[PDB]
Amino acid sequence: KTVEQIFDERYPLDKWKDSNYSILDKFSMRGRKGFVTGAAGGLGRNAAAALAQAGADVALVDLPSQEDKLTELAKDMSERFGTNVIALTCDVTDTVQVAELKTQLVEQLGTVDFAFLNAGVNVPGDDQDATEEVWTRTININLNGTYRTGRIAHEIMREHGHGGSLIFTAALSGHNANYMMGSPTPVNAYGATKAAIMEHSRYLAAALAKDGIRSNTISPGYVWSGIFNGRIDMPGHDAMLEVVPMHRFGTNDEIASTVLFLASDASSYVTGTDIRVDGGYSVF
Amino acid sequence: FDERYPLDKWKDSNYSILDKFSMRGRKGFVTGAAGGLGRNAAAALAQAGADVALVDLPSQEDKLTELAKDMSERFGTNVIALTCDVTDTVQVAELKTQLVEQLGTVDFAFLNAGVNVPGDDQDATEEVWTRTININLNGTYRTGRIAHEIMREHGHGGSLIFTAALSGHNANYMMGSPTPVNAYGATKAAIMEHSRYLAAALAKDGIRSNTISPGYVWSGIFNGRIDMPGHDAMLEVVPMHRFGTNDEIASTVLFLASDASSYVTGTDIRVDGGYSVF
Amino acid sequence: KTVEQIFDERYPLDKWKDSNYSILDKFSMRGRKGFVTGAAGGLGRNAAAALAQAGADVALVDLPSQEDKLTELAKDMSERFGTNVIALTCDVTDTVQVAELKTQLVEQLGTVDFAFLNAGVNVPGDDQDATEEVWTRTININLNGTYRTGRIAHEIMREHGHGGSLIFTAALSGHNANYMMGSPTPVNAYGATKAAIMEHSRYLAAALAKDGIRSNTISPGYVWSGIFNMPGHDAMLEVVPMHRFGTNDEIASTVLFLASDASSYVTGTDIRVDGGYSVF
Amino acid sequence: YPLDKWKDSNYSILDKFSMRGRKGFVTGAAGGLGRNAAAALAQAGADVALVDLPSQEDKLTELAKDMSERFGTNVIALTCDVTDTVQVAELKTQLVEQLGTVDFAFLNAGVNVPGDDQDATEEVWTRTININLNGTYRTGRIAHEIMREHGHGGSLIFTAALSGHNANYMMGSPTPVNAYGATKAAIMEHSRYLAAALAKDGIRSNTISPGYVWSGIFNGRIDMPGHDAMLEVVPMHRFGTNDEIASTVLFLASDASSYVTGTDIRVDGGYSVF
Numbered sequence A: 001k002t003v004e005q006i007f008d009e010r011y012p013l014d015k016w017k018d019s020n021y022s023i024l025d026k027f028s029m030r031g032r033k034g035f036v037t038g039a040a041g042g043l044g045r046n047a048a049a050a051l052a053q054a055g056a057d058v059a060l061v062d063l064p065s066q067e068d069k070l071t072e073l074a075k076d077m078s079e080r081f082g083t084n085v086i087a088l089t090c091d092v093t094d095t096v097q098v099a100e101l102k103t104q105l106v107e108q109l110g111t112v113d114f115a116f117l118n119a120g121v122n123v124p125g126d127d128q129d130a131t132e133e134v135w136t137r138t139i140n141i142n143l144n145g146t147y148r149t150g151r152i153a154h155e156i157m158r159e160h161g162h163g164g165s166l167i168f169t170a171a172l173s174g175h176n177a178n179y180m181m182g183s184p185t186p187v188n189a190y191g192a193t194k195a196a197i198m199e200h201s202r203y204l205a206a207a208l209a210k211d212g213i214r215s216n217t218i219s220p221g222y223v224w225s226g227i228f229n230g231r232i233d234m235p236g237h238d239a240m241l242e243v244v245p246m247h248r249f250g251t252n253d254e255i256a257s258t259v260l261f262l263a264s265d266a267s268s269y270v271t272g273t274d275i276r277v278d279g280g281y282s283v284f
Numbered sequence B: 001f002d003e004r005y006p007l008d009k010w011k012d013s014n015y016s017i018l019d020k021f022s023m024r025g026r027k028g029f030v031t032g033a034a035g036g037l038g039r040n041a042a043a044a045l046a047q048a049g050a051d052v053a054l055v056d057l058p059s060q061e062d063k064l065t066e067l068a069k070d071m072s073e074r075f076g077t078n079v080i081a082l083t084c085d086v087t088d089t090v091q092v093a094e095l096k097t098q099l100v101e102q103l104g105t106v107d108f109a110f111l112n113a114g115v116n117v118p119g120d121d122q123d124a125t126e127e128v129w130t131r132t133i134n135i136n137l138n139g140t141y142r143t144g145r146i147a148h149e150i151m152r153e154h155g156h157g158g159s160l161i162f163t164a165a166l167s168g169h170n171a172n173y174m175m176g177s178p179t180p181v182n183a184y185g186a187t188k189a190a191i192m193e194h195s196r197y198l199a200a201a202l203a204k205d206g207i208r209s210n211t212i213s214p215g216y217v218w219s220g221i222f223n224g225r226i227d228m229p230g231h232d233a234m235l236e237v238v239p240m241h242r243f244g245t246n247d248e249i250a251s252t253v254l255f256l257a258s259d260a261s262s263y264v265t266g267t268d269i270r271v272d273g274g275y276s277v278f
Numbered sequence C: 001k002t003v004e005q006i007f008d009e010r011y012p013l014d015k016w017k018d019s020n021y022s023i024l025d026k027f028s029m030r031g032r033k034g035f036v037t038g039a040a041g042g043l044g045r046n047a048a049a050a051l052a053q054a055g056a057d058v059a060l061v062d063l064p065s066q067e068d069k070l071t072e073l074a075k076d077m078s079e080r081f082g083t084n085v086i087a088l089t090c091d092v093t094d095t096v097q098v099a100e101l102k103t104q105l106v107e108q109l110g111t112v113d114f115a116f117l118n119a120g121v122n123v124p125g126d127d128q129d130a131t132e133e134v135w136t137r138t139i140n141i142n143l144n145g146t147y148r149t150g151r152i153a154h155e156i157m158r159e160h161g162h163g164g165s166l167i168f169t170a171a172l173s174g175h176n177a178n179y180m181m182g183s184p185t186p187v188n189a190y191g192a193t194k195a196a197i198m199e200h201s202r203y204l205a206a207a208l209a210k211d212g213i214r215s216n217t218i219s220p221g222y223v224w225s226g227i228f229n230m231p232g233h234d235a236m237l238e239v240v241p242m243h244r245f246g247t248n249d250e251i252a253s254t255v256l257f258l259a260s261d262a263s264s265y266v267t268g269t270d271i272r273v274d275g276g277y278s279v280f
Numbered sequence D: 001y002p003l004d005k006w007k008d009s010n011y012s013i014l015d016k017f018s019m020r021g022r023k024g025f026v027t028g029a030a031g032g033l034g035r036n037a038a039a040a041l042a043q044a045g046a047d048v049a050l051v052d053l054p055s056q057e058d059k060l061t062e063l064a065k066d067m068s069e070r071f072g073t074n075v076i077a078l079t080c081d082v083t084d085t086v087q088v089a090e091l092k093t094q095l096v097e098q099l100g101t102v103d104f105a106f107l108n109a110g111v112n113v114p115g116d117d118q119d120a121t122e123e124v125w126t127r128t129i130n131i132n133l134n135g136t137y138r139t140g141r142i143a144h145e146i147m148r149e150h151g152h153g154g155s156l157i158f159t160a161a162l163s164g165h166n167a168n169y170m171m172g173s174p175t176p177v178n179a180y181g182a183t184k185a186a187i188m189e190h191s192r193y194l195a196a197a198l199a200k201d202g203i204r205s206n207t208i209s210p211g212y213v214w215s216g217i218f219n220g221r222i223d224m225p226g227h228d229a230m231l232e233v234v235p236m237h238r239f240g241t242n243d244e245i246a247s248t249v250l251f252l253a254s255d256a257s258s259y260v261t262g263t264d265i266r267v268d269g270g271y272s273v274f
C-alpha cells in the first residue's frame, strides 16, 4: 500500500549502497558551532580539541582566573585544526556572567549546535558529616551551575530555530558510592548532584525531542585528567584500581572520543541515556 | 560461623517472624507529617508501638497538634507536633534539640517533606529550579543530617527512609509529552544517590538508609485537581490502573523502619503499581 | 455520584482513623495458600516457616531426593504454626512432574494465592570458559525451571478467578559480577539467568496486573543459608558495608512483605537484601 | 597516562574510529542491523564475515561480494545455525581459516517468537532461550576463545533490546516480549560478566539496546495507526534506521571506546526516559 511506500521513503534500509555515502562522515562536526565548560581542565580541553579536529567552532568556557590559559589553548587549537576556537570566561554560579555568556556565544561564535556542560568540582569534607557550606557549595556549582549553562544552550537552539546535542558530564559517584577498601570516598553531595544532572538530562531529552535537541550524559570512572597529579602515590593508584577490571585510569582522549560520538550524527538516535566510560568499574 | 548465623530461628517456639515488624521501644520523626504519606506513615509506626514526632511547616502547627493528640489516644504512644521549615537552617538546628528533649532519642526518620513547584518544565526559571532544590534536596539533606547525628551521639543504630519519586527514575509520561518534573526529578534522583552514600558511610554505626519511590499515590494532593478522564489518562502507563493509597506507602515505611528490613540498606523500593515496568 | 465522591470511596486517606483497622493486619497470610520451590534449602524452608507463622497453608517443593527432609519439615511447621503445611516433590526441569505438581497443588491445598520461585543452582566451572554442559544445565534449572513453576502458579490463580503474589529469587549476580580480590566469581550463566528472571517477573507484573496478580523479585547478596560449610569470608565481606552475611530470616521477612497486603501497590520491581553491597 | 594527545601532529581523534587491519564477524548479517553494521565496519577498513542461517547463504554471498567491491576489504559469507553446536564449532575453525583471526564479534542474531505473552508455551519459551540466549553465548564464546588462543585483545558487541530493560508499551498493555525480554536481560549481564572476566586479556564486552529500528523486519507487518501508537512513548516520534545502529556498533568495535566495557548503549530515540 501507499502506507508501506511512505515507510520505505521515511526509513532507508541500506545507505551503504550509495557510493557518495560514508558511515565515517557521521563523526564529522564540520559547519557546526558549540561551547565546552570546565575547558581549562583535562576532560574539557581534550573534548573541545577533539570537536575542533572534527571541524567545529568551540568556545572554551571556564573561571575568570583561567582567562590566560583559555586564550592560549583557544589559539593553539585554532592554528592546529584551522577552526574558530574562542575563549569566554563565565563563573556558572553567577547568573549575570551566564546571562552575558549567552550574549557572547551568539555574537562572537554565531550559534550553538552542541554544548559540553563539563564544569564541576569535588569539595573537601564531602562525607556523612558534609557541612552546610560543603553541601550548598557542591549543589550551587555542580547542579545549579550545570542547569543554567545547559538552559542557555537549548535556549539559543530553539531561539535560532534548529536542533542540537547536549552532553552533561555525570560520574559513577552518581550511580555508586566510590569503593575504597571497606569505606566509601567523600562523594556524598558530589554523587547527589551527578545523579541529579543525569535525571535532568533525561527530562530535557523528553521535553526538547520535538525541537530536534538530544540530551545525554557521560559517566567517566577514574580518569587521569591531571586533577590529582602528585596527590596519589602508586600504593593509592593500585589500591583505587582494585575494582576496575582494565586495571588502569582512563585518559582525556578516551572521554574526548565519547563526547565526539554524542555531539556528532553517529548518535543521531541516542537521547536521554548515559554512556559509562569506567573500564568496567560498573560491573563490580 | 554457625553460632552467629542461625539457619532456622523458627525452630525456637518463643521466636516469631511477625515480631520483626514491631516498633515498641522505638522513637523517631516524620517530615511532611501534615500530608497524606507523612501522617499515615507516622500513624503506622505509632500503631506498631513507636513514639513519633510529626514535623511540618509552622503554618501546619494546629493540624499537627490535632493529629498528634489523635494518634497518642488511639495507639497509646508519645506522638507530638514539632514545626520546622527545612529551608531554614536555624529551625532545623532547633528541631534537633527539641527531638532529643521531647522524645529522648531518634531510632528512625521518614524524611518525606517535598514540593512540586509549578512551571517545572524545560523553561524552568531560576526561582522554580532553586526553590525545588532548596526544599527537596537541601531541605532533605539537613533533616537527614540531624537524624543520624542524634543516632551516633546517643551510640545506637537506626533506619533512615527518604521519600524519592518515580520522577527520579523516569519522566512521567502523559499523552506523548512528559509532565513538568524537570527540577523535581533531579532532586529525587539526588536523594536516591544521597541515601546510597549514607547507607555505605553509616553501616559502621549500625544505621540503615533506604528510599521509597512512590508512583501515583492519592494522598490528598490530587483532590479536586483531576477529573475521571484525566485519572484514567494518567494511569494509562500504570498496570494496576489505579492510584496507590497512603496505607500502601505506610506499610512500606514500617518494613524499612522495622527489623524486617535488617539486611536492607543503600537500596530503593518502588511503590508505583508496576509503572517502572514500562 | 460526583467524580470526587467516587475518588473519596476508591482512595481512603486515613484508614488509621478506623478503630477496627490495624497496619499490622496487612502482614497476615491467614486464609492464604501457596508453595515455595527449593523448600529444602535455607531461604526456602525459612520463607515457608514465615508464611505458615503468618497463617498460610504452604506446599514445600524441592527435588525427589529431598522428599524425606520436606516431609519432616512439613510435619514440623504444621505442629508449630497450626496450618496445613504439606510436601510436594518436583524436578523443575521435568514438564510431567510440574504438570503433576499443578494437579496436587489444587488437589491438596485447594488453590494458590502466592508462589516463592526460589529453586536455583550454582554450577561449578561457571566462568568465561563455561562449557555447553555447565551453561545449559544452569539455564535449564534457573531460567526454564523457574518459568514453569511460576507459570502454573498464575495459571491456577486465573483459572480460580482471583489475584495473588509471585516472588522470584533473583541475585546480586543478576545486577553485578560478584567481587573477589580483583576478579569476578564464577557466575557467568548464573548471573545471566537471575537477570532473565528479573525482566521475566517485570513482564508478568505488567501482563497479570489486570488479573490482580503481582510479580516481584528478591536479590539476596551474601546469605549464610547452609550452602556454605577469618580468611575468604572477610575478602567477600570487603565490599559489604554491614560486614556480615544475611541470615535466612532476613530474606524470610522480605518474602512475607511481598507475599502479604503490606506490598499491595508493589509490583514489577526488585528488593536487594545484600547489606549495602549494591552501593559499592 | 598522556594528558594532551591533541598536542601532536601525528594524532587524530577520527583515527580511533578506523578498523584498518581489524578482522571479525557479524551474526544475523542477513537482517538490517547485521548487514548495515558489517557494511559500516567494512567501510572503516575491516575484514568482515557475514554469518546467518544456511537458508540465507545465497543472500549473504551477494552481499559479501557487493561489500568487498565497494570498500576493498575481504568481506566473506559463512552459514551457521546458532542452535546447532556442530555448526558453531565449524564456524570457529572456518573464521580462523578464512579471516586469519577475530579482533571483534557483533553477536546480533535474534528472533521474536509469536505467542510470547504471559501464556508463552514450553515451545515458544524454549525456542526463544535456545536462539537468543544459548545461541548468543555460543557465538560469543568462540569469539573470545579465538582472541585469547591468538594472544590478542578485541571488542565483543551483543545486541540486547529495550525489551531487556522495560516491557514495550502499546495502548495501555505490554507487547508480547515475555521470553524475549528475559533473554535480552540475560545477554546484558552475560556481557557484563565477560567484560570483568576478560579485561586482563585486552577484550571489551558491551551491549547495544535498540528501541524501535525500521530494519526491514517491520515491513508490511504494521499500519500507520499501529506505527504512531508505538511512537507515543518515543520522544523523537520516529523509528531508528540501520545506519544509526551501525554508527553505534563502529564506536563500540573501534578504539574510540577503548575505556568502555561492561556497559550498555541504549539507541531508542528517548524511549528509556518514560
Ligand SMILES: NC(=O)c1ccc[n+]([C@@H]2O[C@H](COP(=O)([O-])OP(=O)(O)OC[C@H]3O[C@@H](n4cnc5c(N)ncnc54)[C@H](O)[C@@H]3O)[C@@H](O)[C@H]2O)c1
Pocket: A037, A038, A039, A040, A041, A042, A043, A044, A061, A062, A063, A090, A091, A092, A093, A118, A119, A120, A121, A122, A141, A145, A169, A170, A171, A172, A219, A220, A221, A222, A223, A224, A225, A226, A227
Ligand atoms: N577526571 C575524573 O576522575 C572525573 C571522574 C568523574 C567525574 N568527573 C567530572 O568531569 C568534570 C571535569 O573534571 P576534571 O577531571 O577535568 O578535573 P578539573 O577540576 O580540572 O575540571 C573541572 C573544571 O570545571 C571548572 N569549574 C568549577 N567550578 C566552576 C565554576 N563556577 N565556573 C566555571 N568553571 C568551574 C573548573 O575550573 C575546572 O576547569 C568535572 O565535572 C568532574 O566532576 C571527573
Ligand SMILES: NC(=O)c1ccc[n+]([C@@H]2O[C@H](COP(=O)([O-])OP(=O)(O)OC[C@H]3O[C@@H](n4cnc5c(N)ncnc54)[C@H](O)[C@@H]3O)[C@@H](O)[C@H]2O)c1
Pocket: B031, B032, B033, B034, B035, B036, B037, B038, B056, B057, B060, B084, B085, B086, B087, B112, B113, B114, B115, B116, B135, B139, B163, B164, B165, B166, B213, B214, B215, B216, B217, B218, B219, B220, B221
Ligand atoms: N502523592 C504522590 O503521588 C507522590 C508521588 C511521588 C513522590 N511524592 C513525594 O512524597 C512526599 C509526600 O507526598 P504527599 O502526597 O503526602 O504530598 P503533600 O504535599 O501533602 O506532603 C508534603 C508535605 O511537605 C511539607 N513541605 C513543603 N515544603 C516544606 C518545607 N520547606 N519545610 C517543611 N515542610 C514542607 C508540606 O507542608 C507537606 O505537608 C513528597 O515529598 C512528594 O514529593 C508524592
Ligand SMILES: NC(=O)c1ccc[n+]([C@@H]2O[C@H](COP(=O)([O-])OP(=O)(O)OC[C@H]3O[C@@H](n4cnc5c(N)ncnc54)[C@H](O)[C@@H]3O)[C@@H](O)[C@H]2O)c1
Pocket: C037, C038, C039, C040, C041, C042, C043, C044, C061, C062, C063, C066, C090, C091, C092, C093, C118, C119, C120, C121, C122, C141, C145, C169, C170, C171, C172, C219, C220, C221, C222, C223, C224, C225, C226, C227
Ligand atoms: N548466598 C545465597 O544464599 C544466595 C544469594 C543469591 C541468590 N541465591 C539464590 O536463592 C535461592 C536459594 O538459595 P539457598 O541459599 O537456599 O541455597 P540452596 O542450594 O540450599 O537452595 C536451593 C534449593 O533449590 C533446589 N534445586 C536445584 N535444582 C532443582 C530442581 N530441578 N528442582 C527442584 N529443586 C531444585 C535445591 O534442591 C535447593 O534445595 C537460589 O535460587 C539461589 O541461587 C542465594
Ligand SMILES: NC(=O)c1ccc[n+]([C@@H]2O[C@H](COP(=O)([O-])OP(=O)(O)OC[C@H]3O[C@@H](n4cnc5c(N)ncnc54)[C@H](O)[C@@H]3O)[C@@H](O)[C@H]2O)c1
Pocket: D027, D028, D029, D030, D031, D032, D033, D034, D051, D052, D053, D056, D080, D081, D082, D083, D108, D109, D110, D111, D112, D131, D135, D159, D160, D161, D162, D209, D210, D211, D212, D213, D214, D215, D216, D217
Ligand atoms: N529492529 C528492531 O526494532 C529491534 C529492536 C530491539 C532488538 N532488536 C534485535 O536486533 C537484532 C537484529 O534484528 P533485526 O532488526 O535486524 O531483525 P532480523 O530478523 O531481520 O535480523 C535478525 C537475523 O538473525 C537471524 N536468525 C534468527 N535465528 C537464527 C539462528 N538460530 N541462527 C542464526 N541466525 C538466526 C536471522 O536470519 C536474521 O537475519 C536482533 O537480535 C533483534 O532481536 C531489533
